[PDB]
Design a binder for this molecule. Structure first.
Ligand SMILES: Cc1cc2nc3c(=O)[nH]c(=O)nc-3n(C[C@H](O)[C@H](O)[C@H](O)COP(=O)(O)OP(=O)(O)OC[C@H]3O[C@@H](n4cnc5c(N)ncnc54)[C@H](O)[C@@H]3O)c2cc1C
Ligand SMILES: Cc1cc2nc3c(=O)[nH]c(=O)nc-3n(C[C@H](O)[C@H](O)[C@H](O)COP(=O)(O)OP(=O)(O)OC[C@H]3O[C@@H](n4cnc5c(N)ncnc54)[C@H](O)[C@@H]3O)c2cc1C
Lengths: 103, 103
């Protein structure tokens, strides 16, 4: 509903300091289409594994199969930025809260 | 085309050190609809007034008349953050480039 699990499908550089993060939300077999729950421009709050630290990211696109695309600028000494540089890997499961369209 | 002039129509401090920024891209009276050119989830590069400093921001939602909404986290001592925190005001006109959906 507002708490989701998602699996990292891609975590790649697309410039010197931007990463494309692709996540696949996980749902029960036979559930409603994932694309019904998420729209481009809405954001989710992603928790860094092993922490209670969350950051908001905008969904650049939502694929037919529900895959969520993010473009994330890496900052020096940033919590989520460090996670993407040192820990994030394809197959890792992360907790997402949302989606939301306002703060 | 790809360079736009936009008026700040809202610049509000909302929850969690986030600013809700609403921009109106400026066009001639009677022009092609802005909202066909800008889509949620795409991003634009906004320049800080009086500088050559630009940052990318994701469009959360787009009005039929082309008003663009962004939710921007204020970082301690960031360039655009510092601008939003203390300098930005309703009625200012800013340069933005885009939209884009890829790197
Ligand atoms: C609705 C929404 C959507 C967003 N969408 C996107 C998106 O699509 N893409 C994207 O890249 N970002 C997006 N953001 C921004 C994002 O949430 C994070 O702010 C960004 O990724 C940085 O997080 P971080 O954990 O890497 O860095 P943080 O841990 O927050 O650190 C940020 C910087 O602060 C510095 N810092 C820490 N403490 C101090 C201090 N006391 N003084 C000075 N500097 C300090 C750190 O060294 C670091 O450089 C969005 C934000 C919101 C609110
Ligand atoms: C495609 C895309 C979409 C995005 N969408 C959003 C969005 O919707 N909302 C959003 O909030 N952000 C978004 N971002 C992130 C945004 O572009 C900016 O990165 C963010 O707003 C910070 O910019 P700034 O000018 O405030 O800070 P900057 O001037 O870039 O500085 C950031 C931080 O770096 C720290 N710093 C500088 N040098 C050092 C050092 N040597 N060591 C440690 N720390 C240091 C500063 O203290 C500061 O905290 C997006 C990024 C991309 C690429």
């Amino acid at each position: 509903q507002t708490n989701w699990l998602a699996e990292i499908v891609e975590c790649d550089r697309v410039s010197s300091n931007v990463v494309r993060l692709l996540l696949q939300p996980l749902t029960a077999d036979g559930a409603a289409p994932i694309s019904l729950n998420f729209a481009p421009g809405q954001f989710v709050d992603i928790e860094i594994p092993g922490t209670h630290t969350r950051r908001s990211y905008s969904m650049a696109s939502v694929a037919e199969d529900g895959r969520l695309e993010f473009f994330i600028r890496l900052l020096p000494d940033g919590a989520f930025s460090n996670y993407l540089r040192t820990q994030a890997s394809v197959g890792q499961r992360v907790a997402l809260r949302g989606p939301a369209g306002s703060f």
